[PDB]
Design a protein around this ligand. Structure first.
Ligand SMILES: [Zn+2]
Ligand SMILES: [Zn+2]
Ligand SMILES: [Zn+2]
Ligand SMILES: [Zn+2]
Lengths: 351, 351, 351, 351
């Protein structure tokens, strides 16, 4: 019974292994996997075997940005059936705790989440999942778009928490994959202009393709100088800044750059301690907000994709079959591409 | 000193008259008028000499959707100067009352407002206005777009109060000018799909041009049937309904149509008493909200226009010089067009 | 095996019957019932065998405002154990649907809810319930206070949706049980003054005891006159009105009474069609909101009770043992009391 | 013409000087000052002649927490008249800028603000002020309560921005005057429990008198230990933390202490750079918000005082006549009291 699976055993130890075919409980579905995007999260576990307090204490299956086809459903599942194409939302609450009740299930301490240990991910042939967290895709939304909902959702959640809306000018720090999905989400939510900063001329070219209104190549500027160049291009201070690099200097830039009364959202992972002009922000009522994944983004993402109101397709720079997963991870690490997409279906390998 | 002015003396009594050149106080500007759109508000005062409790007790200058050029500024005015092209926000608070302080100046009982009596409007050659409520237009935004900010703002304010955002499906009742600006605002704010209903095949054709995702021609349907047809086209109940007709049956339709937990916003003017399945809405937590003009929409409208993120141009169906204002009002009443635009500048009559 | 249960068989057909001892599933608990309040909801099913579209098609156990003691827990239950005193939140979602995910589980169409048919209630000796919807009571919170969380929650949810906060003046229409819990919730949320209207001098005396800052006895006033008398007592128009009678004239009064920009919340059940100065509200941006039960109120209610920050005790006017349930229902119908409280525990019959 | 005035000429240079009687413009009033509280702001200008970028470049009158009696009004003033007792809101916008329009006038860069240079304050006999920012006091609200609205408003604004509401448990860092007003505001807004931390047994005794549910004396605890002790007393992590010391370790404590999804509001002034577990907060969606004074707090503060729903009286520990202002400032600096209150009226020196 063939179920090739990509597994991290520890720092730098990545292996392709055969796994049993999972058996779906009464409210789960079994999925034949199709398209699985990888991101810095996966690469980080690969390299270091941990992300902060999340530690790989036993071999873990990677992969958490995914779509596939229902092949089997549990006795209690009614909204999905074999043949259904679905996007997988990787975080599924185990308990109806208070976070779940108030509608912030992302914060639930007992949540299951693909490829954050000890929870196995979906970079494999066959995978089972809580049925309520698999979302039927319409026929004009590709498997890859379905997989891309996950990174898009990072941007949606951050932009919601920032309060991005009609006419706002927005600064996005970083033209990596995180920055690009926040650019996409901001424009989708009505931002008039997004400026994107980055050190790389290459990444910024790609941010342009994706829809950045302005690009700004940073070199040795101070945070105040960055904020200043940003304001100069926009004609004003941006109501919202989304910081996607985790780099302290970029966080400071965001604080100086953001319009008074505005919001800076931290999406990139920084060091355990950050040094910031906390006062500068606080005295200007610039709020500083973080994000932890996302909640309630799949249906609205699917709605925007299905209506062609957002375009995530240019994000995919590489495709590899599942058998070439180790190479794909090398490609993702070298960071020349954006989204490296893994194709798990021997039957079909198109988008 | 030539300052032709369109004046309503009472029910059906419209005249073009010469007025003195207004003198701007210390915080006012004098404007050479350029483009002035007319709407049902103006036509209503023309026909009936009142809109509810607002009564024309002495001759009134009409016109409240306008743009022009600063020719003179007061001693305290610093952000505008002669030569500046500006959009005029017709509601300017006279006092720093509590509504103003909390940021809801539209509700200020002593607000000045063009062409709502006893306040004279701007359908004339020369007009003076509170400087803080004239907004500089950038050079890639036409005078007509500047004039159109006013009707667009009706839609922006309504859609904000409805909470329209990323991915929502929205029902707009009415394909008249009010309905079309709400269609535009909803899409600009991130709605995935807007369906527009109306009795007229002609108006709906125009709603399509403007960007309606679906159109629905109504005839003798009951409110439940309308709600049903709407749901059928969208694939779900719309999170937001914007009611733009003021027609009781359309209001009821909105109540049946709107998703539970959603919002129905009333923009059209109905009868003094309305009969509604108030309970049906209330038990489904469908909120019912109204609007009174707008507040804080000019800068964000200008930002969206300047970035080409919204297109109001297709709204203009007719242009008349100021001298043909009576004809223009006839055209606006017969309701075959959408926006009838009046050109007040003898120097320039382009958009 | 003794499990006396109060059952409605149809219009005016109420019986006390022995039921099997329910068996808790893996995530349920079995409760030895202690205190069960009754309300117009129960009385309504008794009298008419329906509330609108909710119809008693087979015998139903009544009772939905309750507390008791855990005697048995399911294999998956960890936060509760035998001996735990708990308040029962009667609405427990069956499915993780979209309403649940976004934190509005009250709107879930498949929710289980005590004594709304076809779901049996908890007016009995032994009752089983979803464990996540039973809330441990601290030792300084009585069983009756625990039972009273349910009616209090009606007020909490309504006042939240109204946006009651520090310093607001609030109008509550109706001094029945619904009105009194909204008075309590408004004061708890920081309202400076609550005025309560009613036809009964008796009910208003009780509203005073409970904490009403002003009482207003209505007789033949018109809605405009009511609004006027209200404003006169408060010194201003109330930012919030909570309408608790369902009476059309009282709804109209609320519309005239509420401050511009304010909110009217409809808690009382009215007729299928209501006639209202919808326009008057809409043009003053008075929002009209309804409620459907409550969501996420139990923990904050328990917190306020435990800190003695709210006092629901004066609401209980009568106590009857379970065996005298038919009499208790007669008492509740005659409407001279407020909260009629039923004592189900043969071991203990104190508050 | 006697108008004694307290003036800072520079670091440690405080003088009492006679000033001209100010002349109120058309929308100003002249006030006979009555009660003026002092705070760290005043003391800071006294000691250092600056607070960050706000620098005393010429002699400045101090005092910004004040009340008095209207003696003269401008030609345009209608809501106030000689004899009116009023509370003075020290920040009065000069321009109708965008911050003002959207209801955040506190952020207006051109705002006038008592005793923040170059704007003279109200520690004097006679003072003139923008009429719209003087608020009539009812007869059951004392002059001192009127003066205390200003510090209370600091707490109101911070607690609003934190989202303090019914049932929340709140941590307040610091039992100085800033901490105590935030304790008062939180309880007024419906917090079930407030715990207050501080190094001083004396300050905490006073926080108890004022209404703190718990007090915690800190010594050499680490931020994690503080957060831990806080959680232990409350029985849970507080939904809101208000940090009132500006001390980096206390800010870190707030981050560890605050419930996930919660809010930490920074009210105390810290160093230009702060080192914080920014990541810890961000990954738990603990928002970090600052405050800059307040907006729209006077009317709701007056409403709460007039209804006896909040008690600021215990804050006043000392009273000095204006002639003993230098001593009063010494008393305020030695920090043994809380609110030092200055009495400016030779006619009356009661509360
Ligand atoms: Zn990822
Ligand atoms: Zn108009
Ligand atoms: Zn009930
Ligand atoms: Zn102060």
């Amino acid at each position: 019974a063939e179920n090739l699976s990509l597994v991290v055993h520890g720092p730098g130890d990545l292996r392709l292994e055969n796994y049993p075919i999972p058996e779906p409980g009464p409210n789960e579905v079994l999925l034949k996997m199709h398209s699985v995007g990888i991101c810095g999260s996966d690469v980080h576990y690969w390299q270091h075997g941990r992300i902060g307090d999340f530690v790989v204490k036993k071999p873990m299956v990677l992969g958490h940005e995914a779509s596939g086809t229902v092949v089997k459903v549990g006795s209690l599942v009614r909204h999905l059936q074999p043949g259904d194409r679905v996007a997988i939302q990787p975080g599924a609450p185990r308990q109806t705790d208070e976070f779940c009740k108030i509608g912030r299930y992302n914060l639930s301490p007992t949540i299951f989440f693909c490829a954050t240990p000890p929870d196995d991910g979906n970079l494999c042939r066959f995978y089972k999942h809580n049925a309520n967290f698999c979302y039927k895709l319409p026929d004009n939304v590709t498997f890859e778009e379905g997989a891309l909902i996950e990174p898009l959702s990072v941007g949606i959640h951050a932009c919601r928490r920032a309060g991005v809306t009609l006419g706002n000018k927005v600064l996005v720090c970083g033209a990596g994959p995180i920055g690009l999905v926040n650019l996409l989400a901001a424009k989708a939510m009505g931002a008039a202009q997004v400026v994107v900063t980055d050190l790389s001329a290459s990444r910024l070219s790609k941010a342009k393709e994706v829809g950045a209104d302005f690009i700004l190549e940073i070199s040795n500027e101070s945070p105040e100088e960055i904020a200043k160049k940003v304001e100069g291009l926009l004609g004003s201070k941006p109501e919202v800044t989304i910081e996607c690099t985790g780099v302290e200097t970029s966080i400071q830039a965001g604080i100086y750059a953001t319009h008074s009364g505005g919001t800076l959202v931290l999406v990139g992972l920084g060091s355990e301690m950050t040094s910031v002009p906390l006062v500068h922000a606080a005295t200007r009522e610039v709020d500083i907000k973080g994000v932890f994944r996302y909640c309630n983004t799949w249906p609205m993402a699917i709605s925007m994709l299905a209506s062609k109101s957002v375009n995530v397709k240019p994000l995919v720079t590489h495709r590899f079959p599942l058998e070439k997963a180790l190479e794909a991870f090398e490609t993702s690490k070298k960071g020349l591409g954006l989204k490296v997409m893994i194709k798990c279906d021997p039957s079909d390998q198109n988008p």
